[PDB]
Design a protein around this ligand. Structure first.
Ligand code: SF4
Ligand code: SF4
Ligand code: CL
Ligand code: CL
Lengths: 254, 254
């Protein structure tokens, strides 16, 4: 209870430690990395699973390079054959392979600890990504110091850290096994097309379900795609990408 | 070439024969039955597979009773366990079981032939329903006499036969095995709800795909369901019926 008390609790923890930070680019994973660079010999490690586009990785690298946070990105052949046909435990298996790599880096570098940007608010949601993680003894310092979503934003503003657009995992679009590089690309192009041609600035999802495109969208964005000329253009272009059927989820986001 | 030449060709064929007609209620299957009643000892047989609602069977019975066509309806336990998990050859298996029954009735009644309302235009479309049928030696007299769609309508008007609404098979809505009585009911209620509350008079389909409702509709009917209040009401009521997800096929009918 008190941001300076948390800010100074955090600095005391980082003092004289060799810290490897699970750096992704996101507000939370960025803030933990910046504070660590200023107070400890710190390396921001980004594991490229094949779930985030080149642009998202470039953005993460360009943020660390901008805020003088030492960062190394590791491309991994994670999408294999056993790993590709997972679907239900993939958020655990993906985060288990990441933790496996960070643990290797720490041991090769003879570093002391591995930290992640898990905030306090993140513990009140079903997150199998931090189930697999906290199995491998990864310390979540923000959660331990009760950092809320607005605490992370406020401290970020003070530390001159820009708030980036929320680039989310693209394996989430895959609703039917397997999670293929092409299956994700099909969703990515469909999203990019609808967002650019029809200007869906807010929430947009093109889910893959056995080659069926399920379009999810916000309530106030709805009007932008209701003319039959837009519906025909979307149905036509999405089938050209590779889809069998183009459907729209009538459950619009609140 | 010439309707009276076809009308009189047909009467010559029916003379002195005991005819069992595959009667369904539809314009084509009705016209063949009426002409047969007037010129031969004829029985219009309707096989209730469990694919057409009580109302559709009642309509078929009330048409035959109105046009003094002798008709007997046979309820069959067709939806079983081996027959229920078919999907791709179900239009062949359904029409194979029907032909199996009509052949039994003909042999028990010691009747001469079995005819069906397959018109000439019906031979230029992939119909596995008349593949299974013409295997069991069922004569399609309308097709043999080159009767087109408009020839059937014109002769029907002359014979004072009313043209009914096109009640279609409800196993067609089932896109994922098995074709269950409940699975079809889920589609039927969804169609009845949208057609009554939102007035979709023309083409409307609520397909079942592993508990996912796929709404198919006409191009000019589209406008009737574009307000977010209608979309919310449809998504809500359809999930109450039993669906997991309510989606709309963006391929509107021409
Ligand atoms: S959300 Fe995506 S990146 Fe995160 S654990 Fe799940 S699969 Fe991996
Ligand atoms: S359309 Fe329906 S009633 Fe006709 S053969 Fe196919 S399953 Fe049977
Ligand atoms: Cl994530
Ligand atoms: Cl049929």
């Amino acid at each position: 209870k008190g941001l300076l008390e948390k800010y100074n609790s955090l600095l005391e923890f980082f003092k004289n430690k060799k810290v490897i930070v699970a750096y992704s680019g996101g507000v939370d994973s960025t803030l933990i990395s910046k504070i660590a660079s200023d107070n400890a010999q710190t390396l921001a490690v980004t594991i490229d699973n094949g779930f985030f586009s080149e642009n998202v990785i470039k953005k993460a690298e360009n943020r660390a390079k901008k805020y003088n946070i030492p960062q190394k990105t590791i491309k991994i052949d994670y999408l294999n054959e056993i790993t590709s046909k997972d679907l239900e435990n993939r958020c655990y298996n993906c985060k288990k392979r990441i933790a496996e790599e960070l643990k290797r880096i720490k041991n090769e570098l003879n570093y002391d600890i591995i930290v992640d940007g898990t905030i306090y608010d993140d513990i009140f949601e079903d997150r199998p990504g931090i189930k697999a993680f906290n199995e491998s003894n990864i310390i979540s310092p923000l959660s331990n110091l009760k950092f809320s979503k607005n605490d992370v934003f406020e401290l970020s503003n003070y530390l001159k850290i820009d708030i980036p657009k929320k680039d989310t995992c693209m394996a989430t679009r895959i609703l039917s096994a397997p999670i293929s590089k092409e299956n994700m690309a099909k969703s990515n192009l469909a999203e990019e097309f609808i967002k650019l041609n029809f200007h869906i600035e807010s929430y947009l999802r093109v889910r893959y379900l056995e080659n069926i495109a399920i379009i999810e969208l916000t309530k106030n964005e709805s009007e932008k795609i209701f003319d039959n000329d837009s519906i025909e253009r979307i149905n036509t272009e999405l089938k050209k990408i590779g889809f069998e059927k183009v459907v729209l989820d009538l459950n619009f986001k609140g």
